[PDB]
Design a binder for this molecule. Structure first.
Ligand code: ADP
Ligand code: MG
Lengths: 434, 28, 233, 145, 70
């Protein structure tokens, strides 16, 4: 129901072993930028390089941010994408470098694929089997504990390691409870009374859960996605409980802290260990920093160092500026807002302005997105105005035109409504004139 | 048991796994 | 934080409760204990059988006869609403905990759903720390983790997909926008474009003046990129 | 007597009305609803996170040897009464006697894993290695042997 | 407010009436410049009395508004 500024951007719209179609995925034109984004996306999917920088350079409205959104969608939600604005780096609780490093490590992702075998049942039989004592002593010995489990269209009786007794004691399973038991771990959890005994007592505080479906033995593969920043935050934070450390943590508000290099190296080491064990996979991801002009010179120098880091994502930067002094410098007039040192480490891609037909196609597709109907003459007038003042100006004037048409009980936009909106809402140029 | 003696059977199974009124109230 | 305050989330909660004045409680204990309990309303009376955990909760709440209590059959939590008026005479001074309430009417077991209006900023603050609801008034909330905000967006989307939560977008009004800095405007340029961005109205009185944080004059003190995505009245 | 009981009933009525008027801004049910962890249970919880994520307490516990080896310095000067005077638990403090005793009992019952750091930084007790090191001649004997 | 003259805690008429200690109302006698009065108090007020460590002869102060004993 919402209509954001980029809802039409469904993807880059390339074809296998080919190029960008003229109109596909909501984009129109900008073929070169889409092809460059496609090759960059393929490189990122290759997952074999680190610290590759691209700069979306172009005039305002030229689709820079739309192109970053296209990259994000093309990689999909499975690849961890971390949008960020250059203004966001200037925190008050920590230094800028800390925020940049946290974002850098936030962009990298880890995928853990674990398969587990589990039995899960209400409990029926519970009978230990006596066996001869190797040490004698006239004592009563058991060699297995026997459990019977019921499930929809399933039942089995299991002989278990006697050690289960201690688990069963701790869990305090009773007959008629629904329990979770791990095939290799010997761990047990109970979660339920079966709904079949919910009628035995009119009142009971515990929650009765439906009996498990399927065969009692079920094999499930669980996939989880995590980021290095999440891991660091979890490891840098107290567990949380009744101990005094948690008490002083509750007293003092948790502010951001400079996570030491030791913790980062420890996290990297444990991640490497578990990856070598074969359970986890690494996903680099993309960190898009819009309005890269807003970064200070110190942030640029740390990017200079951080791009050389052995583990870093692919950074996409956008800039709408021309020849302006780099922030944090007094007399360094440089192309875009990027200082020359960072320019040497990045790649620039151009985003061309738009023609009349391109503006018209963009306007008609945007109107299609907003569930509006427009006449051909109204479309021509709208495109003329967009070429007269601004494209985004027309794309914003679209909605009040629809409201004005609705006020006339009409389901289609007419030139009169367009002129009415033009009179009501002034553009940037006409306001500058006043 | 320490003198190499077995325990009670019901106690054995209970340890392996692990009437009168007491409170009546009414509003006068 | 200002932007999220301008968006509200209307969330529906379904509650099932039993409320009534307990008439008689009889508990027998050896083995596990068993007992029977009677609860009446203004137009109903019923005898119930109590499980061990229900009896434990009753004992730990120290409920007596003539008290109006509420039990959630999902969790069994027992809350003492108050005492009857008939027991008021029994004392000269009353404790802080005591309360006098009438006996509830109607059926003993009732189903009720309640709609709650909570802003996104409030949800983020509540879900950030263990005591964020105090920071919702104190204002010492700090810079919430971005991963928390993304998770909250995902959760709100999940609720909306399941149909138990509704979004009520609002209007953000910024008085004297020329008091902002260039960094704030550069953030706003992208921030206006989020799917959950509200509708922002901006009021200014300065004409062609010098933008704060820059060394040049501007048509209204705002960068041209922001004016591009702004209609001027 | 009847006038007195009428006045008492009026006062009780007003007090009860004021006591029932208490309301929360957000109910604890609302707090739970906005705080509830969606539908996540231990059925689909990742076991690997118990080793990938290690809190500060288990890190203090596991690294016992380094803490024992490298905690050497002790405070230059201390004043023992400041330990209890800082928290207001002294006998002549403004804190109430019952509350003070309750706080003391809670502190006694609470568990702290950082005790080892406290006891190492309290007294610089030398270990069994010093008998190797205190005598240079014993050092030479060790190497020669 | 006044000076405590008597403090006679009472249990319920039946042992089955309550839980554990089953302590019922407490009777307190206060003395002032204009006379004496015998009060009947809630067990919560008795708990407050126990918390404040009040003995016979101590001048006390009870607020019926909140049940706070000083
Ligand atoms: N090639 C394009 N295809 C479709 N829409 C576009 C395109 N370029 C720009 N737009 C429209 O304009 C906006 C994108 O502008 P943006 O990428 O932010 O440029 P800039 O970063 O220069 O301001 C979007 O709201 C979108 O509707
Ligand atoms: Mg942009």
């Amino acid at each position: 129901t919402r209509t954001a500024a980029h809802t039409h951007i469904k993807g880059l719209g390339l074809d296998e072993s080919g190029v960008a179609k003229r109109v596909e995925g909501g984009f129109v034109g900008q073929i070169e930028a889409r092809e460059a984004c496609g090759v960059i996306v393929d490189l990122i999917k290759a997952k074999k390089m680190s610290g590759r920088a691209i700069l979306l350079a172009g005039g305002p409205s030229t689709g820079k941010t739309a192109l970053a959104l296209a990259i994000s969608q093309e990689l999909g939600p499975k690849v961890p994408f971390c949008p960020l604005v250059g203004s966001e780096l200037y925190s008050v609780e920590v230094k800028k470098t800390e925020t940049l490093m946290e974002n850098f490590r936030r962009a990298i992702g880890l995928r853990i694929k674990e398969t587990k075998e589990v039995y899960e049942g209400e409990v029926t039989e519970l009978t230990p089997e006596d066996a001869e004592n190797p040490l004698g002593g006239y004592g009563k010995t058991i060699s297995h504990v026997i459990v019977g489990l019921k499930s929809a269209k399933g039942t089995k009786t299991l002989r278990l390691d006697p050690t289960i007794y201690e688990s069963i004691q701790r869990e305090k399973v009773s007959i008629g409870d629904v329990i979770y038991i791990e095939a290799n771990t010997g761990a047990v959890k109970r979660v339920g009374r079966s709904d079949a005994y919910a009628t035995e007592f009119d009142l009971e505080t515990e929650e009765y859960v439906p009996l498990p479906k399927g065969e009692v033995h079920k094999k499930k593969e669980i996939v989880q996605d995590v980021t290095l920043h999440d891991l660091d935050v979890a490891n840098a934070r107290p567990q949380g409980g009744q101990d005094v450390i948690s008490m002083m943590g509750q007293l003092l508000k948790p502010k951001k802290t400079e996570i030491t290099e030791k913790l980062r190296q420890e996290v990297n080491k444990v991640v490497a260990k578990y990856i070598d064990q074969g359970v986890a996979e690494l996903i680099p991801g993309v960190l898009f920093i819009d309005e890269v002009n807003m970064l200070d010179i110190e942030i640029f120098t740390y990017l200079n160092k951080a791009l050389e880091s052995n583990i870093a994502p692919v950074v996409v930067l956008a800039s709408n500026r021309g020849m302006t002094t780099v922030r944090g410098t007094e007399d360094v007039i440089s192309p875009h807002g990027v200082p020359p040192d960072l320019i040497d480490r990045l790649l620039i891609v151009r985003t061309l302005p738009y023609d009349k037909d391109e503006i018209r196609t963009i306007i008609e597709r945007r109107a299609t997105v907003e569930r509006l109907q427009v006449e051909s003459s109204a479309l021509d007038l709208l495109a003329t105005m967009g070429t007269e003042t601004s494209l985004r100006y027309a794309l914003q004037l679209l909605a009040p035109c629809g409201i004005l048409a609705q006020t006339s009980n009409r389901k289609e936009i007419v030139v009169n409504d367009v002129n009415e909106a033009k009179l009501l809402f002034l553009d940037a140029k006409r306001s500058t004139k006043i | 048991d320490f003198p190499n003696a077995p325990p009670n059977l019901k106690d054995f199974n209970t340890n392996l796994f692990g009437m009168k009124t007491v409170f009546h109230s009414i509003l006068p | 934080q200002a932007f999220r305050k301008s968006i509200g989330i209307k969330i529906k909660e379904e509650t099932e409760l039993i409320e009534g004045e307990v008439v008689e409680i009889q508990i027998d204990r050896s083995g596990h204990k068993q007992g029977k309990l009677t609860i009446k309303t203004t137009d109903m009376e019923t005898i119930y059988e109590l499980g061990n955990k229900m009896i434990d909760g009753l004992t730990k709440e120290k409920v007596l006869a003539g008290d109006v209590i509420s039990i959630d059959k999902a969790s069994g939590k027992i809350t003492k609403l108050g005492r009857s008026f008939a027991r008021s005479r029994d004392y000269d001074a009353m404790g802080a905990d005591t309360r006098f309430v009438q006996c509830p009417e109607g059926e003993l077991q009732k189903r009720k759903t309640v709609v709650h209006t909570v802003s996104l900023h409030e949800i983020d603050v509540i879900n950030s720390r263990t005591q964020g609801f105090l920071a919702l008034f104190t204002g010492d909330t700090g810079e919430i983790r971005s991963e928390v905000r993304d998770q909250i967006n995902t959760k709100v989307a999940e609720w909306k997909e399941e149909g138990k939560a509704e979004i009520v977008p609002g209007v953000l009004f910024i008085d004297e926008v020329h008091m902002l800095d260039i960094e704030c405007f550069s953030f706003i340029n992208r921030a206006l474009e989020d799917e959950f961005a509200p509708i922002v109205m901006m009021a200014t009185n300065r004409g062609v003046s010098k933008t704060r944080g820059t060394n040049y004059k501007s048509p209204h003190g705002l960068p041209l990129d922001l004016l591009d995505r702004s209609i001027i009245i | 007597k009847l006038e007195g009981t009428v006045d008492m009933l009026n006062f009780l009525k007003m007090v009860n009305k004021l006591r029932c008027d208490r309301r929360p801004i957000f109910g604890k049910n609302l707090i739970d609803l906005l705080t509830k962890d969606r539908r996540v249970k231990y059925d689909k919880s990742s076991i690997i996170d118990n080793e990938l994520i290690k809190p500060l307490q288990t890190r203090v516990l596991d690294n016992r040897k380094i803490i024992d080896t490298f905690a050497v310095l002790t405070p230059s000067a201390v004043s023992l009464d400041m330990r209890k005077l800082a928290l207001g638990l002294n006998d002549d403090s403004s804190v109430g006697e019952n509350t003070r005793l309750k706080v003391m009992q809670n502190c006694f019952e609470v568990s702290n894993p950082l005790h080892q750091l406290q006891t190492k930084l309290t007294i610089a007790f030398p270990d069994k290695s010093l008998l190797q090191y205190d005598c240079g001649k014993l050092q030479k004997l060790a190497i020669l042997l």
